Amino acid sequence: KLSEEQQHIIAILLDAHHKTYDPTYADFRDFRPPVRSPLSMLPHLADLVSYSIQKVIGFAKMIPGFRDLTSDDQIVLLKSSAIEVIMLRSNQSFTMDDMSWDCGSQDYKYDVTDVSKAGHTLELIEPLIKFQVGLKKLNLHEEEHVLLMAICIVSPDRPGVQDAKLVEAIQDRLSNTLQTYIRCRHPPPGSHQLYAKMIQKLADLRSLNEEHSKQYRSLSFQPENSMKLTPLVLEVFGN
Amino acid sequence: KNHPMLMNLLKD
Numbered sequence: 001k002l003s004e005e006q007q008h009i010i011a012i013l014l015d016a017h018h019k020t021y022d023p024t025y026a027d028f029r030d031f032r033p034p035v036r037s038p039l040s041m042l043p044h045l046a047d048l049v050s051y052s053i054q055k056v057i058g059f060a061k062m063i064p065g066f067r068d069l070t071s072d073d074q075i076v077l078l079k080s081s082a083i084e085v086i087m088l089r090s091n092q093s094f095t096m097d098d099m100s101w102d103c104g105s106q107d108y109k110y111d112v113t114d115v116s117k118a119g120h121t122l123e124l125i126e127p128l129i130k131f132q133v134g135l136k137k138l139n140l141h142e143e144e145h146v147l148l149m150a151i152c153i154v155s156p157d158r159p160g161v162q163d164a165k166l167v168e169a170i171q172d173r174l175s176n177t178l179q180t181y182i183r184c185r186h187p188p189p190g191s192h193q194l195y196a197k198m199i200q201k202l203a204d205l206r207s208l209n210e211e212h213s214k215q216y217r218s219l220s221f222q223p224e225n226s227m228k229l230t231p232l233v234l235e236v237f238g239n
Numbered sequence: 240k241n242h243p244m245l246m247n248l249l250k251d
């Protein structure tokens with residue numbers, strides 16, 4: 001069923017994730033502290049998001065084939081996908097108890113009001129929670145989770161991509177691996193239904209990306225807000 | 240634009 005190459009890819013992506021997602025959340029103590037300013041949570045959550053961008057870059061570099069892309073295409077894929085992979089990877093800390101992101105302590109536990117205290121409105125947050133709930137209900141194995149993140153990043157339809165055919169070839173291999181993994185665990189029609197819902201999630205992420213971009217542009221236009229961001233966030237999310 | 244920070248993180 002799963003070929004040696006497909007097992008290889010999954011092993012590599014699982015290891016990449018283990019090396020770039022820290023489930024102890026130990027580094028959160030190095031951020032500017034959460035304060036519960038109208039945007040009182042923006043220092044803390046800008047540091048968290050900027051840290052997460054760094055981890056997404058570290059994950060992306062280990063995706064088989066990502067190295068074969070030009071530096072230009074690597075940059076455009078990361079710039080376009082960073083926000084989506086952040087939304088996807090944050091689902092590992094999301095909890096269905098109170099619809100919040102629980103990072104090991106009450107100080108580092110974030111609800112809808114915390115996200116609104118970083119500047120976003122329910123225009124973004126309501127669909128983001130709906131997204132997190134629906135992804136949680138898929139009950140993905142870690143193997144599917146890491147494949148979805150990689151498929152998310154290596155998408156040939158990102159604006160700016162120069163070698164779309166190469167990007168597509170890389171993504172096709174990942175997509176074939178994920179489809180085969182699903183088939184190994186689930187007979188039809190459940191296999192097709194599950195893959196279909198994972199594809200819908202990637203489409204949802206594009207809409208969330210667009211809405212985040214709109215709200216980020218309006219927020220970062222005020223210098224009193226940009227002042228609270230990090231240099232890495234300004235570079236990656238700007239432009 | 241250029242992206243020296245992202246590029247630097249890509250070259251690690």
Ligand SMILES: CCC(O)(CC)COc1c(C)cc([Si](C)(C)c2cc(C)c(OC[C@@H](O)CCC(=O)O)c(C)c2)cc1C
Pocket residue numbers: 020021022045046048049051052055083086087089090093101102103110115118119120212216219229233
């Ligand atoms: C600063 C620009 C701005 O637009 C604000 C002007 C950012 O807005 C936000 C956006 C887009 C998303 C979120 Si969130 C989906 C609730 C989220 C994100 C992360 C990274 C996170 O960390 C968990 C793991 O990811 C650990 C780190 C890792 O990934 O290794 C958690 C628990 C939640 C929150 C804000 C504030």
